[PDB]
Design a protein around this ligand. Sequence first.
Ligand SMILES: [Zn+2]
Lengths: 158, 263, 96, 346
Amino acid sequence: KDYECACGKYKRQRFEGKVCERCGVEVTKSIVRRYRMGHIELATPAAHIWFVKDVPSKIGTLLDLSATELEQVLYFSKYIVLDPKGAILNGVPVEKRQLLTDEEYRELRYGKQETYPLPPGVDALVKDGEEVVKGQELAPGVVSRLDGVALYRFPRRV
Amino acid sequence: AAIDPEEEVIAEAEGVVHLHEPASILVVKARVYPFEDDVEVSTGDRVAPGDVLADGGKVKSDVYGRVEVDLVRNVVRVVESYDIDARMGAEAIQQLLKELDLEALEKELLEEMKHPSRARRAKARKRLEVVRAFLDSGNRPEWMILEAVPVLPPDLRPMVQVDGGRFATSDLNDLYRRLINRNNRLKKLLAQGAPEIIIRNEKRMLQEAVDALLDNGRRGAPVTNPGSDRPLRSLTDILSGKQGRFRQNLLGKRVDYSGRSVI
Amino acid sequence: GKAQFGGQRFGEMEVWALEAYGAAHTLQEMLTLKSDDIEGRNAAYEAIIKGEDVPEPSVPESFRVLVKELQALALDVQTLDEKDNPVDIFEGLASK
Amino acid sequence: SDPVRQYLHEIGQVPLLTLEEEVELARKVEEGMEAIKKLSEITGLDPDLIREVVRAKILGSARVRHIPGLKETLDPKTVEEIDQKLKSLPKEHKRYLHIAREGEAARQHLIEANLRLVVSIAKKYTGRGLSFLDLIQEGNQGLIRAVEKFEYKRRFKFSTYATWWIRQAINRAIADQARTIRIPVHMVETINKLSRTARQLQQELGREPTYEEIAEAMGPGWDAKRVEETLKIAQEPVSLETPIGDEKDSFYGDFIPDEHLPSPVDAATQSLLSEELEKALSKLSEREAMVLKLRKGLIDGREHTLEEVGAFFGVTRERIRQIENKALRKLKYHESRTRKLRDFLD
RNA sequence: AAUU
DNA sequence: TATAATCGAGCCGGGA
DNA sequence: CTCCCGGCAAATTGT
Ligand SMILES: [Zn+2]
């Protein structure tokens, strides 16, 4: 309402510019509700769709990223590498602005491992802590797919 | 150890222990570094070859990896893996956009302008036109990514009581609400340390909420009010088309002092 | 529409007619005092009931709507004078 | 290309837990919280601050941000200081750090392993005003709650405890977010009750029930007036962009007058009135014109009592009543003479 | 859906 | 707050 | 080529 704060402490134009302490509302023309903007502070930055999806994409064009690549990074289908930190994948070093899948990112970032179920009652051939080559037999029916340290999960019998 | 004092296994006398019939065997590609005294790195820490692990500096790591401190096996595992920086979403892109030296890219692209192949010169031009746009204008490319999202003044998206005391409201209010809800939930999930799968889902949903707000239907299925097939009317829809702001309220208007009748 | 006591639509093609006649002041009236120029239409009515000539128009409110809608899209639209300095068409109401 | 399908694929990349694995993680989490409690005692550091620092190192450098309840800004400077103070503990104390660390790690894994549970619960609550993915995230929020409260000792499977927390979380979301005009959860509860009841009444009566019939069916406290007021409150707004019949060439908002901004006539009329009112008040003494302005609210917007006007001009409540009537009488005289203000009475 |  | 529950359901022109 | 997005007369009325 014109020159009237929310709670009504200051109700006329003698106060113009006052900000009511109780209710917090400015005394001015109500017309400003057509003019004054608010804003939302995002937790994560978000891309403006015009500069993504308007072809040829402006963001894609500056960064030399195709339509498909830019979609995949923006919509969380693929990682893009900012700093390889000496990473290497499949024998070749990971270079910046390279796209990694989830499996590729997890293997790089958290390492590669595998867990092998043991047929009920069957006891292991190798012992806990023992280094194992790929292809080596863990149990009568269990063969390891990768090199590394074998670890016992839940011993049923001590 | 067990739930109740009984059923516990307490050692009857002096002896040595052997483990049998494990449920599964976990093969990890990792290095094991046993330690007699105290360990200086705690579990989860990231480590490069040469970093000190336990026993005041005696034992150190041979590989790049992630620290697993085993208090049972009394060994410090290092799981082979790197401190690699790889990101998803608009945050990654905002970073790559900040890290653009447009001056350099103009130079690089001009050198590309001397190449004989027609396609080489053509693409370098289109890129160079975008580069030059930003250069001449003074706009920073990272502005194509939003951090603060503007909110249109309320009287332009009104909530008004119609004649019958009923309420009528603009579709933008619902589009903002989806945004606000998803942003707030994202803040909460961050403070509560949700797993990356959950935080990632929230982030991609946040992008879609911004997308529907700015241009609904542009990417992916259009956002609708419940139990209606009508796409909500977004900012882009308001501006453009026959019914848009330009061709409806700007290049033509309804006017006062006017009338009509049969001739 | 008649049921709302409406005004007639003076649409794009009608504006073309006023343009082809070169009737610039007639056209400006359609775009401001007889439509969405709030300050203008109020002042124009007051002048007619007082016998004065109608005043020169002000900014159409629908342009202000356009400006704010482009701000909601994170686009900065600035009305500038010949010196390329900003002109405030909101008359201080929208600036802190 | 489909956000739901995508999420379904990512959850399917975390294998479900074995009975053993479930207990191990749940166990490590409980033990880990206990470790953080002790680290509080030993160090004298807020349990939450310790928990956030432990959690920071587990999740990695990726997530570092300010946490609300915490008094200190949480940044690598403070997390190194606090982590370095924790690593400054003697071996028997420093063991609790390793436990807390493994607790956070196990919690992450426990949560991730139950995400498919949330999906199967969320799919049943669709169509109530939240999108499928919105329901999943709120359900996930509950799943996070369940992991913190779970007591593994009771030997119940996790799915049993979580389901309560997940259902609770989704239902709060629907009650909290589904309406453009937000309604308190309890009020939302009443409305749904009123709906269910009427649906029963219509199924037995073979026709729509009256307000009175619903008020009886609702029990004590309810009459028809309250049934009606409740339904009025339950009305959702309608879109200004709803298309009107014919071609899609007209929206509903276009038929709604603006009742707020004065019309050209009104602007003219009110302005002319303000000007004639002042012409008559300057023809009063300053002292007797100011009293009338204070009493009718033309100054400050409030109509002041007789006692208050006495305090500002420092006179008696009866004196102020007297100058108002003589002021108003003199005003009345100038009016009968100039006929200026008569036409504004409509 | 009408009128021109 | 504790049985257990664990992956959805119109024709047309122009430009990358 | 194929696909993906942008266009596709005006004013008026009526339930
Ligand atoms: Zn106030």
